[PDB]
Design a binder for this molecule. Structure first.
Ligand SMILES: [Ca+2]
Ligand SMILES: [Ca+2]
Ligand SMILES: [Ca+2]
Ligand SMILES: [Ca+2]
Ligand SMILES: [Ca+2]
Lengths: 319, 319
């Protein structure tokens, strides 16, 4: 997994230098300054770059696992990246490949973190300092639901460095991030002209750890990010996170679980969090599907309704 | 003060009608919706509109007075308007003409406020409902340093209404806002080529209750909001909030006081907060000038250096 830092130095070497000298790592290739935020204009607010220790008393890299509940979009149009990350978290092992072991703020910590991305035919080590964009003592971009947790915020920073700025992450394709996390090639399915066995294709893809996404087509640039009356977002990358079934009126009903990378704002029809359908599903069956009422961005849908409401599904296999 | 609402009704009439029915006022002319936020478009993130009661438990309109410390800019390039508001706060009679007298969340509260702006030949009375943009339970745009204080956030909303949207306020003229708050006649001075009597003109103007701003020239529009090594923001409207002489190492140095509408990020050099100049200064002259070290936005500088680094000074005189 190839060194890409301009020093030519390795993540462990640079880390070890800092520990010996007793300083924190400052990244010479992606500085904590305005050009790493935006290229098209300076920001209108006083951004202050801060290490996680300067943000909370007790920072932690991973806390309670690196999970999809840790992907909450900030003020950046990178729904496509984060949906890819949330999808990546369903495979512990595809995740360990993008996120090298034993990173923390405990012993060994020198202000330096590293992540692995697949670019162009290869696996790059991308090294960062943990100084993050803040405003009013808060992260502005990607944050975990738990404000003591920084792995998602750092991964996004590393990915922003990959693309030269945070602004370059505005608008993209889930496939781009999916490929960058896996080194696979993404297949696009088109929701209303999908094979007869489309459900089985997704079930089996999810089971072997493939990254699944889906989205609603936007007819015009005017329609981007429009909330439909059903509580869905147009032109917005969602993670497909579950494929399952329940008995309803004594029939098997094919369900699909979807996650908004915002971490909130959800479907409001059949099998949504507070819909009537659930009152006639018992507690065992319901605990198995992990159904709860929470505005966490994750909801179930009937696969039939999913196909009708969404327009595209992407599958990216691991290898 | 001219009625401006499509209903033809006054502030008092809509207010009495609302508490007659036991409801909260929704403004037909400036709805809590995207049209009121942007015009090319949407936010990349779900702003929810919340009344101050839904944001904070004990909301209040004014607290500790309506002062310039209540003007901390949010995520919007309306420094020009904010610099003007802060300037306005130093003349309490002028400020009362923009902000009607008995507004609060106490008895008679009905989700309805109003402000008054001079538009060319008449004062306009501009009514709003107090639904304000928030994201992650925090106001996004203008907010007081005290989170339970909403007058300035409200003023900015109402001023956004006057201009059609919150986006309308991105970029603007400080003289325009100063004249809208006062009805006075503007006066621009070029700092480098000003009268050999300029310091007194400013002192007289500030004492007179006039509004004063200052700013540095933008070469490019791509230079807008760039920082100097001295910690000033280019293309950025400041309020001039104090003029005062002090004695220091034998001479008398003319000092000027300036405030960033960010409420944060200040001058670096001589006479800055944590500059050594102050030590040579008695504690009796220190607490007259209100010298403290805190990231106020607000700072003193030596008049020579003010001329040296700022380009234009705008005064809005009532007399
Ligand atoms: Ca976690
Ligand atoms: Ca949910
Ligand atoms: Ca106050
Ligand atoms: Ca800069
Ligand atoms: Ca200060």
């Amino acid at each position: 997994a190839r060194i890409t830092h301009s020093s030519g130095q390795s993540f462990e070497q640079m880390r070890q230098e800092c520990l010996q000298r007793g300083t924190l790592f400052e990244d010479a290739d992606f500085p904590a300054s305005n050009s790493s935020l935006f290229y098209s204009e300076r920001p209108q607010i006083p951004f202050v770059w801060k290490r996680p220790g300067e943000i909370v008393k007790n920072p932690e890299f991973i806390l309670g696992g690196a999970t999809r509940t840790d992907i909450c979009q900030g003020e950046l149009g990178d729904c496509w990246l984060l949906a890819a990350i949330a999808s990546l978290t369903l495979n512990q092992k595809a995740l360990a490949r993008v996120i090298p072991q034993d990173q923390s703020f405990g012993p060994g910590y020198a202000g330096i973190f590293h992540f692995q991305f697949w670019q162009h035919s290869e696996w790059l080590d991308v090294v960062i300092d943990d100084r993050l964009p803040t405003f009013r003592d808060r992260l502005v971009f990607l944050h975990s639901a738990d404000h003591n947790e920084f792995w998602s915020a750092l991964l996004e920073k590393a990915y922003a460095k990959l693309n030269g700025s945070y602004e370059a992450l505005k608008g993209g394709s889930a496939i781009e991030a999916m490929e960058d996390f896996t080194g696979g090639v993404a297949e696009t399915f088109q929701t209303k002209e999908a094979p007869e066995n489309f459900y089985e294709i997704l079930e089996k893809a999810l089971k072997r750890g493939s990254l699944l996404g889906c989205f609603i087509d936007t007819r015009s640039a005017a329609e981007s990010e429009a909330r439909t009356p059903f509580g869905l977002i147009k032109g917005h990358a969602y993670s497909v996170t579950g494929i399952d079934q329940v008995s309803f009126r004594g029939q098997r009903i094919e369900l699909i679980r979807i996650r908004n990378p915002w971490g909130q704002v959800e479907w409001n029809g059949s099998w949504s969090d507070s819909s009537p359908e659930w009152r006639s599903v018992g507690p065992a069956e319901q605990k198995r599907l992990c159904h709860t009422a929470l505005d966490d961005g994750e909801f179930w849908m009937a696969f039939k309704d999913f196909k009708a409401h969404f327009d595209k599904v992407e599958i990216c296999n691991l290898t």
